[PDB]
Amino acid sequence: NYDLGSTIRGLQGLVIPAQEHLYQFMEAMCGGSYAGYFGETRTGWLEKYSTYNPKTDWLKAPFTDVISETYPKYYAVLQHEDAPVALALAKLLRVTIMQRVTDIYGPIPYSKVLNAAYDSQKDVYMRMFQELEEADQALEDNMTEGNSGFEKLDDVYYGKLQQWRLFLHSLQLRMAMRLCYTDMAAEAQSIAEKAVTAGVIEKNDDNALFHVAENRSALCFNDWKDYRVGADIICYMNGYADPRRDKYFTKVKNNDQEGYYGMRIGINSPFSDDDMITSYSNRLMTASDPYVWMTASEVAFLRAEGALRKWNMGGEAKDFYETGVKLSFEEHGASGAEDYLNSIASPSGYTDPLGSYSTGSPANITVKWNEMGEQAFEENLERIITQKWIALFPNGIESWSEHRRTGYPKLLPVVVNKGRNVSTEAGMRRLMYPNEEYTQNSFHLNNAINVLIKESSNNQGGDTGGTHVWWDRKAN
Ligand SMILES: [Mg+2]
What we know:
- The longest helix has 22 residues, at about 85-105.
- The protein has one domain (about 1-475): Serine Threonine Protein Phosphatase 5, Tetratricopeptide repeat (Alpha Horseshoe).
- The chain has helices spanning about 5-10, 20-35, 60-80, 85-105, 120-140, 160-180, 185-200, 215-225, 230-240, 245-250, 275-280, 295-310, 315-330, 335-340, 375-390, 395-405, 435-440, 440-455; strands at about 40, 210, 225-230, 250-255, 260, 290-295.
- Helix 4 (about 85-105) packs antiparallel against helix 5, helix 12 (about 295-310) packs antiparallel against helix 13 (about 315-330) and helix 13 runs parallel beside helix 15 (about 375-390).
- It has a two-stranded antiparallel sheet. The protein has a two-stranded antiparallel sheet with strand order 2-6. A two-stranded antiparallel sheet has the order 4-5.
- The protein has 18 helices and six strands.
- The N and C termini lie far apart (about 55 Å).
- Helix content is about 45%, strand content about 5%.
- Strand 4 and strand 5 (about 260) form a beta hairpin.
- It has about 475 residues and is mainly alpha-helical.
- The chain binds magnesium ion.
- Magnesium ion binds near residues 341 and 342.
- The PDB classes it as sugar binding protein.
- Keywords: TPR- like protein, PF12741 family, Joint Center for Structural Genomics, jcsg, Protein Structure Initiative, sugar binding protein.
- The assembly is monomeric.
- Crystal structure of a susD homolog (BT1281) from Bacteroides thetaiotaomicron VPI-5482 at 1.90 A resolution.
């Protein structure tokens, strides 16, 4: 029983996964650990994403489940609808889902899906850019005032095609910035500039949120209690005395504790699960919360970086930076942005309230803009990306990609590095292909690994967490 609305909602639920079974792996364990946002409370787990040795069958969900769930919905739209807007929205959602997947793995099945042959990450990005333009043209040529017909078929923008275009342009901007260290940088700059000109998300009312009657991801944090907040994000936000903390996190309040506390990521604690659950802050969320895809704050930080790089983003780097911070405060109902923007406080050292994994501060980057501008390029990039990372919480996959790309924010090293060809100093550079690909798709997988090796600025044994994906080319 095909229904276009259910199919579109199905696709919208594969961006930030709306099924808890998929969420726990892709977002809580993978994005969470590698962005410095969350650690796992379960002390019995010895093959973990956070220690770079995820149990083999825990590698299935971010690759195999995303792909196997996406394509039947995508092809249902294509076989039932000839309306250009339906096809354009399906196309845009497929790009949105799969941008994340190629950023995690590098080469992925994409253009030849009909298992399947893999495209190079470069070929995935170029094809996505071509598809985003095709979707955008179809939206622009068919949009109207009043109802589009998709009002009851779409739980992100409730049928408002104008807002879908802002989002599409914002995604083009994000993906362009991703490629600024590759041989496609000139094209990326042009794409970014045209995207900004076409109109990106600038107001919080236009943020792309997937609204849901029940946010099942809340189970992972509130009910299962399998994750708590990581040390890194707490070190920065406590150091900065960030007014957003009471909107992001719960307080831990007991005999020896009152405030915001983070757990060291990449450890094998000798304490109990109850100790890990009760001694560290949780994220603050409810079962009615939306999933946040793209915000005005993120777009402002992208424009700030662009401007710092002398791309034509329509304004000054400092102004976009300050606007990004202001927009994030506004998004969360937080006061004090203007004073916060002049802060010269450093990220704090890490004090483990249980006394096991205390360590020095991850960075000395402050909030206040360095007026040398591009003459302090790396420092100002560091604060743009650090502030974007705070504003992005809990979007770990995006923050992980940006951390890989730019080196920022600087995060605390894991303690227990049980990775295979993964360095403690550089961290996870990608995820490894699932064992299903080895057993069931071995011809295509073998070619994929060869493509990953050829595309990489830094091969570390082929299909490992150490090998760089194609866009991860910055020299350190
Ligand atoms: Mg100032």
